[PDB]
Design an enzyme around this catalytic site. Structure first.
Site, PDB file in Angstrom:
ATOM      1  N   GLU A   1       1.575  26.645  62.688  1.00 14.92           N
ATOM      2  CA  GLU A   1       0.709  25.485  62.574  1.00 14.92           C
ATOM      3  C   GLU A   1       1.333  24.302  63.287  1.00 14.92           C
ATOM      4  O   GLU A   1       2.563  24.225  63.438  1.00 14.92           O
ATOM      5  CB  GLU A   1       0.465  25.161  61.079  1.00 14.92           C
ATOM      6  CG  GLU A   1      -0.402  23.920  60.795  1.00 14.92           C
ATOM      7  CD  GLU A   1      -0.640  23.662  59.296  1.00 14.92           C
ATOM      8  OE1 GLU A   1      -0.131  24.442  58.455  1.00 14.92           O
ATOM      9  OE2 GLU A   1      -1.341  22.672  58.961  1.00 14.92           O
TER      10      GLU A   1
ATOM     11  N   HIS B   1     -12.672  17.180  43.924  1.00 15.27           N
ATOM     12  CA  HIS B   1     -13.773  17.134  42.966  1.00 15.27           C
ATOM     13  C   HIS B   1     -15.042  17.553  43.709  1.00 15.27           C
ATOM     14  O   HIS B   1     -15.828  18.372  43.225  1.00 15.27           O
ATOM     15  CB  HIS B   1     -13.922  15.697  42.436  1.00 15.27           C
ATOM     16  CG  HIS B   1     -15.009  15.514  41.413  1.00 15.27           C
ATOM     17  ND1 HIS B   1     -15.365  14.257  40.956  1.00 15.27           N
ATOM     18  CD2 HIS B   1     -15.775  16.447  40.795  1.00 15.27           C
ATOM     19  CE1 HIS B   1     -16.331  14.459  40.079  1.00 15.27           C
ATOM     20  NE2 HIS B   1     -16.614  15.766  39.943  1.00 15.27           N
TER      21      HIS B   1
ATOM     22  N   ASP C   1      -4.097  21.681  45.714  1.00 13.50           N
ATOM     23  CA  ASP C   1      -2.867  21.553  46.486  1.00 13.50           C
ATOM     24  C   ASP C   1      -3.039  20.688  47.736  1.00 13.50           C
ATOM     25  O   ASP C   1      -2.544  21.016  48.815  1.00 13.50           O
ATOM     26  CB  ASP C   1      -2.348  22.939  46.877  1.00 13.50           C
ATOM     27  CG  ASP C   1      -1.175  23.400  46.015  1.00 13.50           C
ATOM     28  OD1 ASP C   1      -0.960  22.814  44.928  1.00 13.50           O
ATOM     29  OD2 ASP C   1      -0.469  24.353  46.431  1.00 13.50           O
TER      30      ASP C   1
ATOM     31  N   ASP D   1      -1.407  23.336  53.876  1.00 12.02           N
ATOM     32  CA  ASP D   1      -1.171  24.243  52.765  1.00 12.02           C
ATOM     33  C   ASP D   1      -1.960  24.012  51.497  1.00 12.02           C
ATOM     34  O   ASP D   1      -1.388  23.948  50.410  1.00 12.02           O
ATOM     35  CB  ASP D   1       0.306  24.265  52.443  1.00 12.02           C
ATOM     36  CG  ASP D   1       1.095  24.942  53.516  1.00 12.02           C
ATOM     37  OD1 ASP D   1       2.037  25.687  53.184  1.00 12.02           O
ATOM     38  OD2 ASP D   1       0.757  24.738  54.701  1.00 12.02           O
TER      39      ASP D   1
HETATM   40 ZN   LIG Z   1     -14.041  12.765  40.503  1.00 19.36          ZN
END
Ligand SMILES: [Zn+2]
Ligand SMILES: [Zn+2]
Lengths: 259, 253
Positions: A161, A194, A208, A218
């Site tokens: 990467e 979210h 992550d 990652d």
């Molecule tokens: Zn939220």
């Protein structure tokens, strides 16, 4: 009219053996495969197919440091067709021979294709997320492309990467645990996770989130169907919505999925 | 707002064991060195010096014929574009018998490229002093030294020339009978190099396509082959247009 002394000289020169001292092999030979997209112009709506024909490339093994499933920093001397940036720094990632024994056989290779795919999944979400997000939101999170690489001398498969240098921080983890944002950059990142849960209707959730500023790396993509059931829950209990979740108009997490 | 079945599928399949089949990289990568010039824009008054850095270039083998034994190839990519990408290039090696007559094959090469450049330089001069009367302008191609890793060896690389190829003379005074202008100029040039270099050198083996030659033979007088050309070369209207004295004459009058 005849040849000047300059001329006569340069020509007589060629007639005799001129010195030839070739600088030696600055680097290590390597082949690299990429995950191709039908129409990259529209990432989210596109089919991901692996490549069959590997590009030859060369990378100088810079450091002796294996930071960790560790990774090494290497320099790309030349890249075939310029897949990798001929003249920039890359990270070579790989997994531990034990986290490999924990399988599916010939694991290493697969594991890499999976991680590159998992990351591509994040990218699609990211592309979709940035593609339909109120122009109010300034920062756009992004993941760099990851390539499959094959070392000949070492004889092993790695994921490569574009290595970034800068302020690296963790916005949250696959445990559901998140940080309390300060800057708006921090808020967006946290709202994004979210978001993925909403967009994919509870099917997936990207965790992550880490990296330097806007450029991420990652990640960890989670499917409802440990990390599956558990992480998806902790995150809903833990998560604290913010300015963005509002602006994005996303329903609270910690609530009943039947109302 | 939510997501379609397309993405739902692509996204989900990305999470599924997509198939991966490693085809063996096509063609082989080699290393190429070139004979650089202190002033490319004036080949005649510029020094030539081999390069130390060997930029990588990927090539694909096409032909396998032995027409020095040569072979056709296609450059697909080159570092810092040393070789025009997507261009056909020829790779010549040395005849087995011609080689066993002196590590030497490497030298046998650096020499032939060195040779062609001298011819190349001589042409730059010719084209420079050339009258308006002589329209055709002879040109030599640039040759490179490359190293095959697989076949483990050195070779010369020149671009593939398209069109009818013919030889106007050889290292033996054997020269065609000019059937048209071009050929006259080609026969003349040889004579003209002997005059220009003051009898020091002679460029023979004039062959190639049109005004674009290649694989020349440059003779140095000490001078036996120089004998033949002096006896055999027949001046044409071109030798005259260039005012080239009659080769068969006395060197001290
Ligand atoms: Zn939220
Ligand atoms: Zn003549």
């Amino acid at each position: 009219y005849y040849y000047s002394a300059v001329e006569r000289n340069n020509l007589m020169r060629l007639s005799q053996s001129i010195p030839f001292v070739p600088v030696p092999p600055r680097g290590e030979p390597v082949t690299v495969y990429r995950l191709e997209e039908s129409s990259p112009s529209i990432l989210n709506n596109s089919m991901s197919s692996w490549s069959q024909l590997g590009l030859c490339a060369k990378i100088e093994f810079l450091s002796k440091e294996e930071m960790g499933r560790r990774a090494v920093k290497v320099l790309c001397t030349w890249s075939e067709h310029d897949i990798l940036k001929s003249g920039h720094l890359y990270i070579i990632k790989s997994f531990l021979p034990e986290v490999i024994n924990t399988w599916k056989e010939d694991t290493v290779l697969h594991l890499c294709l999976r991680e590159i795919q998992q990351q591509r999944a994040a990218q699609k979400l990211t592309f979709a997320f940035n593609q339909m997000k109120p122009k109010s939101i300034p920062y756009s999170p992004r993941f760099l492309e990851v390539f499959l690489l094959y070392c000949h001398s070492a004889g092993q498969w790695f994921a490569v990467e574009e290595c970034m240098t800068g302020e690296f921080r963790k916005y949250n983890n696959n445990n559901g645990d998140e940080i309390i944002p300060t800057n708006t950059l921090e808020e967006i990142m946290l709202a994004f996770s979210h978001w993925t849960y909403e967009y994919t209707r509870g099917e997936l959730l990207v965790l992550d989130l880490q990296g330097v500023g806007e450029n991420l790396t990652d990640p960890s993509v989670i499917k409802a169907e440990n990390l599956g059931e558990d992480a998806i829950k902790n995150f809903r209990a833990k998560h604290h919505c913010n300015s963005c979740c509002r602006k994005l108009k996303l329903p609270d997490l910690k609530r009943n999925d039947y109302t």
